Structure 1
């Protein structure tokens, strides 16, 4: 039980453990694409004296945070302990080694998608974005008088084969990810992967169609088993016009009873309809999780609300340092101090505040975030809040 960087001879063993550990595993030939995003010394394996009983790696990602600021992000992925080697501290050992490497490489943040909601808090990760399934019963769906693009003349939305409009989707996604907190750069190899899953699989998923606007696209497919349900896999709109136009087109799928989509809590769709209730929230879950690797570097890099006035405090992160935090003009200055702390939180809590998805008041109500001054609580709420609402880019 020694902890090493994998050699090329180790990957077949890692793919075996992946196949047994993740039910959604897309096989080795598809894993070559994602492997391009793993830097040299981005992966750790544990061997038993021999085969692979343990693995974890990070990918080089670019995360957009409030103020349209793009951070280098270590994306944690492909974490797996053999069923034969549980309760043996292999995860603790692997996560520690990667965090060392992530820290020493100069990543201010790491991020992951959690398989369970109870594992990653202890390693410093906080849930930072919220996933939100909306299901529209589109038979009753009528658009409000106030809704855009409900006038005579032509539609701007086209129905198209995804594979023949890759360039337009890239262009739109690139505009989208740069201006939305939670946005991730989607490299070429992940566009290759995304469009290979657009085509119909024998006894698998059905053909994916696209609705294409100058400033938006929606990829959808009819469900395998439920043939009256369209699953919107991905809708990216840069303008409210594009968003609305795309939903007029989706509500126009007259052979479907229900359109479903995984979106964000602030999706304006419910307000496009004469009946808000027709867009039911069927499902809600933690999206992206953040570990703030370097507190001063992260707090300084993001923009803050211009609306709150200048204010200063001392933030203590448990075993992560104490800081004089001065916020004003939507910039922050974060500097070492030994002054008495006014606000205390574990590092995972800072992850949950960092993109604006969670309010400091809420975490304080749970005593995850201690302060004796509620004026300071309101000011943190206001400053950390995001003007553009926070969204989840793509699962990794």
Structure 2
């Protein structure tokens, strides 16, 4: 029968052997790198599995990310590589694994969690719901070329510039109160900057990173504070583009390029969705940034069989960009939500769509205006996939 387990650096082959049944083998190249990058998860309590008898039959790992929510950085458990063997169909193997993944994360002090679901039913059942997007837009390289900004000094960047990149990014997001985006460890970011096939460029108030990994020029991140720098960095890109007509870029759907280029992005675009769950509701609220003008005094009834600790009646108290979540004895027409409703609300989804989706019931409409302006802001997005 079924046993939760900590994957050893040994049994990585077993994990790959399971994974293969659903995805086929890796190239011997991509395989050597998969294994090299797994060891860190293994020796930091961040690679879990399910064993049946003496046989690894399921596995999942946990990134220790941080994530911007309203301009603050909240520790989050990014779940990836969930695999279950096909001959263990419908024996609730995935649920045991995921129940272990969840408490491992709660134990390590991650008040929230996120993933890209391969299917949605299994994750909705454990209390996840959609929280944001990843957008990919396509541009014409010639357009990026004629943006100008030739006076701006742009140089090539390497791993010695990681401190500088974090600084620029953390300044930008804190200003705009961004939500959804990943914070990568300064360590992990230097590696990215050392990658022979990663091209990174630094101006005084911005940077750009792009790659050629698929026959196509792709921009992974652009950050720029002034118009000048923005035009220089995009022109550096359009200039690296050789003769290719088009260039892809991961960016917010509010990004200033759209306001700068002469041809609109191509109508064909990529829209992905990622999911969110709260693991420690008070803590998540504590770390969150709230819209600076927000007053809100609201009670809410929480039903979370999966994390009973945060189940019950609570009062939300927010003002001055900060929030607190505390138990409550009150007795009124309160708001009722489950883990999904609770995660979706944290993610700034409008209460109208949540009532229509049945993810929340009850309470007065006065409260709906409040939480909409409190949890409101720019729509959550990220640039990464995992």
TMscore range, shorter length: 0.7 to 0.9
Cα deviation, 1:26-65, whole Å, max 9, x if unaligned, reads: 4244433343245644333222324311112323322232
Cα deviation, 1:180-208, whole Å, max 9, x if unaligned, reads: 43343423663466357653xxxxxxxx5
Matched, 1:124 2:124: no
Of the candidates 89, 99, 102, which is equivalent to residue 92 of structure 2?
89
> TM-score if structure 2 supplies the norm length?
0.82
- Counterpart Cα distance in 1 of 2:188 and 2:260: 32
Q: 1:205: which partner in 2?
A: none
- Counterpart Cα distance in 2 of 1:359 and 1:61: 26
Aligned-partner SS, 1:7: coil
- Counterpart Cα distance in 1 of 2:384 and 2:261: 27
How many angstroms does 1:283 deviate by?
Answer: 1.6
Of the candidates 160, 163, 185, which is equivalent to residue 167 of structure 1?
160
- Counterpart Cα distance in 1 of 2:95 and 2:250: 32
- Counterpart Cα distance in 1 of 2:18 and 2:195: 23
Aligned-partner SS, 1:120: helix
User: What's the C-alpha RMSD, in Å, of the aligned pairs?
Assistant: 3.1
Question: Compared with structure 1, are the counterparts of its residues 83 and 150 closer, same or farther at alpha carbon in structure 2 (3 Å cutoff)?
Answer: same
How many angstroms does 1:173 deviate by?
Answer: 3.6
Q: 1:203: which partner in 2?
A: none
When you count helix as a share of all residues, which structure comes out higher? 2
Of the candidates 59, 63, 67, which is equivalent to residue 59 of structure 1?
63
Of the candidates 306, 313, 327, which is equivalent to residue 298 of structure 2?
313
Q: 1:204: which partner in 2?
A: none
Q: 2:282: which partner in 1?
A: 296
Given that 2:296 and 2:371 are in contact with CA atoms closer than 8 Å, whether structure 1 keeps it comes out as: no
Matched, 1:345 2:343: no
Matched, 1:7 2:4: no
Aligned-partner SS, 1:247: helix
Q: Which moved more, 1:189-198 or 1:84-93?
A: 189-198
Of the candidates 33, 42, 47, which is equivalent to residue 37 of structure 2?
33
Q: 1:184: which partner in 2?
A: 182
Matches within 5 A, 1:1-396: 1-22=2-23, 26-37=30-41, 40-68=44-72, 70-139=73-142, 150=148, 154-158=151-155, 160=156, 165-169=158-162, 171-173=164-166, 175-177=168-170, 179=174, 180-187=178-185, 190-191=188-189, 194=192, 198-199=196-197, 208-222=198-212, 224=214, 229-232=216-219, 234-237=220-223, 239-241=225-227, 242-252=229-239, 253=241, 255-275=243-263, 277-278=264-265, 280=267, 282-287=269-274, 289-308=275-294, 310-319=295-304, 320-338=311-329, 339-340=331-332, 342-356=334-348, 358-386=349-377, 390-392=380-382, 394-396=384-386
- Counterpart Cα distance in 2 of 1:186 and 1:198: 19
How many angstroms does 1:244 deviate by?
Answer: 3.8
How many angstroms does 1:292 deviate by?
Answer: 0.4
- Counterpart Cα distance in 2 of 1:46 and 1:355: 31
Question: Compared with structure 1, are the counterparts of its residues 61 and 209 closer, same or farther at alpha carbon in structure 2 (3 Å cutoff)?
Answer: closer
- Counterpart Cα distance in 1 of 2:167 and 2:343: 25
Cα deviation, 1:132-182, whole Å, max 9, x if unaligned, reads: 111113446797xxxxx856x623234x4xxx6122255214541573433
- Counterpart Cα distance in 1 of 2:286 and 2:185: 27
Given that 2:166 and 2:186 are in contact with CA atoms closer than 8 Å, whether structure 1 keeps it comes out as: no
Cα deviation, 1:75-123, whole Å, max 9, x if unaligned, reads: 2223110122121110111111222332344321122232334432221
Q: 2:308: which partner in 1?
A: none
How many angstroms does 1:359 deviate by?
Answer: 2.5
Given that 2:296 and 2:374 are in contact with CA atoms closer than 8 Å, whether structure 1 keeps it comes out as: no
- Counterpart Cα distance in 2 of 1:244 and 1:371: 50
Q: Which moved more, 1:322-331 or 1:58-67?
A: 58-67
How many angstroms does 1:346 deviate by?
Answer: 2.1
- Counterpart Cα distance in 1 of 2:13 and 2:265: 48
Cα deviation, 1:201-229, whole Å, max 9, x if unaligned, reads: xxxxxxx544432333323334635xxx4
Given that 1:314 and 1:341 are in contact with CA atoms closer than 8 Å, whether structure 2 keeps it comes out as: no
- Counterpart Cα distance in 2 of 1:390 and 1:127: 10
